[PDB]
Amino acid sequence: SFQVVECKTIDGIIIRGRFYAVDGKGPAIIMTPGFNCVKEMLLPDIAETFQSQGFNTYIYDPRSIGDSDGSPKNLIDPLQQAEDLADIVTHISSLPSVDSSKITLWGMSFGGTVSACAAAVDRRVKALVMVCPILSFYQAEKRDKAFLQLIRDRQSQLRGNEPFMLPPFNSKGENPIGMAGSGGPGGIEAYGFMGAVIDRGAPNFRNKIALQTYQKLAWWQPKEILKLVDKTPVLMVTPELDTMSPPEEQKAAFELFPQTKKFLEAKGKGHLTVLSGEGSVEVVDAMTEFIRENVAG
């Protein structure tokens, strides 16, 4: 079972999520969802397993997504999500069942990359688990047109209009900057995945993002920030057949880490199925084993 737990940020926004408590006092895993995803997608199954193995688990809706505060809505600023995680760590660490000396950050897809940036600056984070992290976003041939569209949206907003919104993946699987498989099979699979959250769980899931998201992604240089993560024990889980985040891009980042680390390839899996189907129970067990070994108080 879970309780609703809210964390305040330094600018006064409320982040909302599910807290799966354990009896007594024990470690805590804070799980960040993927790009524009809500906490109810896929992660509750993982959190229940974590909880049954003795880990407090917090799944939350990031800023401007789902149940959480934040305006404009579905404006995905990965660097703001990274800073928000410091404030989430502060509140989760204060809870009665949480051992503030055994905090782990866990992230899937976009959220794994966000979690790494938070880990870079926060020594309270004792381990980092990245599942299928996404590390690049722009296709070079699309850059200038996307930048132009961004500037035009600013001009429209200055005239008094609300921020331009769009589905992160259209029916061709595409989006203006070419991210996450756009133009290929990955983008079509993401389109179907986002459009097939046509099912209960989450009243505040919205299959749209602010175009200005792409401005934040233009600034973000996560491969450079990951180089600051030079002490935090890190587990990376990469799908062999990831059509949204190139596996060799994930491997290239993993190879650079100098500290204690572990790599897991999920054979035959894609970006969205890496934690589903067969092999998944073994992958989750591998995560709790890595956390148990490296986050020992």
Interface positions with Cl ion (CB under 5 A): 96-97, 99-100
User: By C-beta, is 2 or 147 nearer to its own copies?
Assistant: 147
d(CA 135, CA 180): 10
Indicate the residue among 87 and 99 with the shorter CB distance to Cl ion.
Answer: 99
Told to check if 144 binds Na ion by CB under 5 A, we report yes
Q: Which does 224 bind (CB under 5 to 8 A by kind): Cl ion, its own copies, Na ion, none?
A: its own copies
Which option in Cl ion, its own copies, Na ion, none does residue 252 bind, with CB closer than 5 to 8 A by kind?
none
The H or E element that residue 110 is part of is: helix 110-121
Question: Which tokens go with 182?
Answer: 């756009």
The residues binding its own copies (CB under 8 A) are 8, 10, 79, 82-83, 86-87, 90-91, 117, 120-124, 143-144, 147-148, 150-151, 154-155, 157-158, 215, 218-221, 224-225, 228
Of the pair 10, 256, the CB lying nearest its own copies is at 10
Picked from Cl ion, its own copies, Na ion, none, the partner binding residue 97 (CB below 5 to 8 A depending on kind) is Cl ion
Nearest to 19 by CA among 91, 87, 86: 91
Residue 123 touches Na ion, criterion: CB under 5 A: no
For the CB of residue 247, give the shortest distance to Na ion in the complex, in Å: 27
Decide: 176 and 147 in contact? Cβ < 8 Å.
Answer: no
Residue with Cβ nearer its own copies (148 or 252): 148
The full 3-state SS of 183-218, as one line of letters, equals: CCHHHHHHHHHHHCCCCCCCCCCCCCEECCHHHHHH
Q: Which is nearer to Na ion, 144 or 255 (CB)?
A: 144
Site for Na ion in 49-78 (CB under 5 A): none
The nearest distance, CB 214 to its own copies, in angstroms, is 10
Q: From the list Cl ion, Na ion, its own copies, none, which binds 145 (C-beta under 5 to 8 Å, kind-based)?
A: Na ion
The answer to whether 26 touches 102, Cβ cutoff 8 Å, is yes
| Helix, strand or coil, per DSSP, at residue 2 | coil
Tokens of 113: 């990359």
Q: Residue from 3, 45, 145, 152 that binds Na ion (CB under 5 A)?
A: 145
- The listed partner (its own copies, Cl ion, Na ion, none) that binds 218, CB under 5 to 8 Å by sort, is its own copies
- Within 10 angstroms of residue 142's Cβ, the number of other Cβ atoms is 19
Q: Does 152 bind Na ion (CB under 5 A)?
A: no
Residues 6+ apart with CB under 8 A from 111: 31, 32, 33, 34, 35, 37, 62, 81
- Residue least distant from Na ion (Cβ): 145
CB of 175 to its own copies, least distance (A): 17
Nearer to its own copies, 224 or 255 (CB): 224
Q: Identify the three-state secondary structure at position 39.
A: coil
Q: What is the DSSP string of 132-156?
A: S-------GGGHHHHHHHHHHHHHH
Looking at residue 42, the DSSP 8-state letter turns out to be: S
Where do contacts with Na ion occur on this chain (CB under 5 A)? 144-145
